[PDB]
Design an enzyme around this catalytic site. Structure first.
Site, PDB file in Angstrom:
ATOM      1  N   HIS A 200      18.792  51.432  46.234  1.00 56.96           N
ATOM      2  CA  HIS A 200      19.003  50.650  45.120  1.00 56.96           C
ATOM      3  C   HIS A 200      19.505  50.529  44.654  1.00 56.96           C
ATOM      4  O   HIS A 200      20.841  51.348  44.430  1.00 56.96           O
ATOM      5  CB  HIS A 200      17.132  50.763  44.414  1.00 56.96           C
ATOM      6  CG  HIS A 200      18.043  52.380  43.535  1.00 56.96           C
ATOM      7  ND1 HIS A 200      18.130  52.308  42.685  1.00 56.96           N
ATOM      8  CD2 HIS A 200      16.927  53.446  44.708  1.00 56.96           C
ATOM      9  CE1 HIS A 200      18.470  53.877  42.726  1.00 56.96           C
ATOM     10  NE2 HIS A 200      17.682  54.408  43.685  1.00 56.96           N
TER      11      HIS A 200
ATOM     12  N   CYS B 112      17.391  58.826  47.487  1.00 52.81           N
ATOM     13  CA  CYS B 112      17.688  57.053  47.046  1.00 52.81           C
ATOM     14  C   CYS B 112      18.470  57.378  48.251  1.00 52.81           C
ATOM     15  O   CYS B 112      20.040  58.415  47.520  1.00 52.81           O
ATOM     16  CB  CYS B 112      17.320  56.889  46.628  1.00 52.81           C
ATOM     17  SG  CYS B 112      15.544  56.188  45.942  1.00 52.81           S
TER      18      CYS B 112
HETATM   19  C1  LIG Z   1      15.493  57.610  45.098  1.00 53.69           C
HETATM   20  O1  LIG Z   1      16.405  58.996  44.917  1.00 53.69           O
HETATM   21  C2  LIG Z   1      13.829  58.385  44.473  1.00 53.69           C
HETATM   22  C3  LIG Z   1      15.219  57.149  43.102  1.00 53.69           C
HETATM   23  N1  LIG Z   1      16.256  57.173  42.939  1.00 53.69           N
HETATM   24  C4  LIG Z   1      16.903  57.795  41.706  1.00 53.69           C
HETATM   25  C5  LIG Z   1      17.726  58.565  41.627  1.00 53.69           C
HETATM   26  O2  LIG Z   1      19.363  58.010  40.492  1.00 53.69           O
HETATM   27  O3  LIG Z   1      18.159  59.158  41.956  1.00 53.69           O
HETATM   28  C6  LIG Z   1      15.757  57.702  40.645  1.00 53.69           C
HETATM   29  S1  LIG Z   1      16.189  59.301  39.937  1.00 53.69           S
HETATM   30  C7  LIG Z   1      17.369  59.520  38.522  1.00 53.69           C
HETATM   31  C8  LIG Z   1      17.844  60.704  39.287  1.00 53.69           C
HETATM   32  N2  LIG Z   1      18.974  60.947  38.416  1.00 53.69           N
HETATM   33  C9  LIG Z   1      18.436  59.494  37.056  1.00 53.69           C
HETATM   34  C10 LIG Z   1      19.375  59.396  36.161  1.00 53.69           C
HETATM   35  C11 LIG Z   1      18.794  58.386  35.559  1.00 53.69           C
HETATM   36  C12 LIG Z   1      17.659  56.884  36.602  1.00 53.69           C
HETATM   37  C13 LIG Z   1      16.982  57.353  37.082  1.00 53.69           C
HETATM   38  C14 LIG Z   1      17.233  58.585  37.561  1.00 53.69           C
HETATM   39  C15 LIG Z   1      14.300  58.109  41.624  1.00 53.69           C
HETATM   40  C16 LIG Z   1      13.647  59.194  41.679  1.00 53.69           C
HETATM   41  C17 LIG Z   1      12.825  57.650  44.954  1.00 53.69           C
HETATM   42  C18 LIG Z   1      12.767  56.347  45.019  1.00 53.69           C
HETATM   43  O4  LIG Z   1      12.270  58.587  44.317  1.00 53.69           O
END
Ligand SMILES: *C(=O)[C@@H]([C@@H]1N=C(C(=O)O)[C@H](Sc2c[nH]c3ccccc23)[C@@H]1C)[C@H](C)O
Length: 350
Positions: free
Chosen positions: A279, A297
């Site tokens: 994503h 992710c």
């Molecule tokens: C996959 O890793 C996880 C999904 N991917 C995200 C990511 O950025 O790693 C978010 S969590 C997140 C961690 N740091 C951030 C900073 C800003 C906004 C969001 C996040 C999310 C957990 C799967 C889909 O669960």
């Protein structure tokens, strides 16, 4: 010679299965009249052969019915008439199957046949035998259960592009164990498209997209931090979303728990049931291609995420290698290819 009447059922019978039509045939004569009515008296649809030798029901017969069959045969030697009453299977429960992928869809080389029942299946073998898979070109494959409700079918290796796949789930009238019968039949057909395999190498932090062997895209990525790493292995591409709110409790983790989360992201392609996505991650663009920062992710640029959304389809393959994580579970839901063929082929119907 007096005409002879032979029915596909017997006058005493109970537990007559409705997975097949009821028929009557005449010998040394022809069928002059055949009628079959249910309990209240409603006649069942049926057709007689042109030569008058065979009659059979033409509509679906019901569970828990008492049918009465009346037939008359006429021949030179005289006449014969019979009356038969029988009772069909009475299920304690019904289950409806749901098949993926969709009818007429084109999918990637990693897409398994998926049959998910809305009830637990006591007799897995009965379910498997009721499912007819046709492939063209023909390829060997086998059933394997991910859980008590969903069974998968796949070949040893990724599908060859251009393969036609036909799935007929013929469980209507079939005893699926413990009095559980199929609610109806379902049938889908799909086709295998181009070979698309995207490889994420933790040693380079690059997601490389290969189409029929040629590199078409090289995406810098940021995968799971050492704390919550990305599992190595083969992932099957699932659903895709222009945008989706990512809820941790969907995947078990309470939102306000330590590793919980609830965030809205763009251009998300699901590659595991456990919640691994490709994503858009604008916040970590500086990290992508250098350092892992995610919850697992495959973080890429907004541009590359949209490209992935546009160019990758259900059933395409993502392979992750060289991370500090383990191997993606074979029974994840999109991890089927991580099960060794010898184990998959053996199946788990018992
Ligand atoms: C996959 O890793 C996880 C999904 N991917 C995200 C990511 O950025 O790693 C978010 S969590 C997140 C961690 N740091 C951030 C900073 C800003 C906004 C969001 C996040 C999310 C957990 C799967 C889909 O669960």
């Amino acid at each position: 010679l007096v005409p002879k009447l032979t029915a596909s059922v017997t006058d005493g019978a109970v537990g007559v299965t409705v997975d097949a039509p009821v028929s009557v045939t005449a010998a040394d004569g022809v069928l002059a009249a055949v009628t079959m009515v249910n309990d209240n008296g409603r006649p069942v649809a049926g057709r007689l052969s042109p030569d008058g030798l065979r009659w059979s029901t033409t509509e679906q017969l019901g569970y828990n019915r008492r049918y009465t069959l009346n037939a008359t045969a006429l021949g030179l030697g005289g006449a014969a008439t019979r009356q038969l009453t029988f009772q069909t299977s009475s299920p304690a429960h019904l289950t409806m199957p749901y098949v993926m992928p969709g009818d007429g869809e084109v999918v990637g080389v990693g897409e398994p046949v998926a049959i998910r029942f809305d009830e637990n299946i006591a007799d897995r073998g009965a379910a498997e035998k009721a499912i007819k898979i046709t492939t063209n070109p023909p390829v060997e494959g086998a059933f394997y259960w991910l859980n008590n409700r969903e069974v998968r079918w796949r070949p040893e290796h990724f599908w060859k592009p251009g393969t036609a796949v036909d799935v007929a789930v013929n469980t209507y009238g079939v005893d699926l164990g413990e009095g559980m019968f199929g609610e109806d039949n379902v049938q889908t057909h799909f086709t295998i498209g181009d070979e698309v395999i995207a490889t994420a190498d933790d040693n380079t932090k690059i997601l490389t997209v290969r189409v029929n062997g040629e590199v078409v895209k090289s995406m810098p990525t940021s995968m799971g931090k050492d704390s919550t790493p990305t599992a190595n292995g083969i992932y099957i591409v699932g659903s895709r979303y222009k945008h989706i709110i990512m809820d941790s409790s969907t995947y078990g983790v309470p939102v306000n728990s330590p590793n919980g989360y609830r965030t809205d992201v763009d251009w998300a392609t699901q590659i595991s049931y456990s919640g691994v996505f490709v994503h858009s991650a604008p916040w970590s663009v500086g990290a992508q291609g250098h350092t892992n920062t995610s919850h697992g992710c495959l973080n890429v640029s907004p541009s590359n995420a949209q490209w992935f959304y546009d160019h990758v389809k259900r059933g395409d393959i993502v392979e992750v290698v060289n991370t500090v994580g383990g191997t993606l579970p074979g029974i994840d839901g999109l991890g089927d290819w991580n099960i060794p063929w010898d184990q998959w082929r053996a199946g788990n119907a018992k």
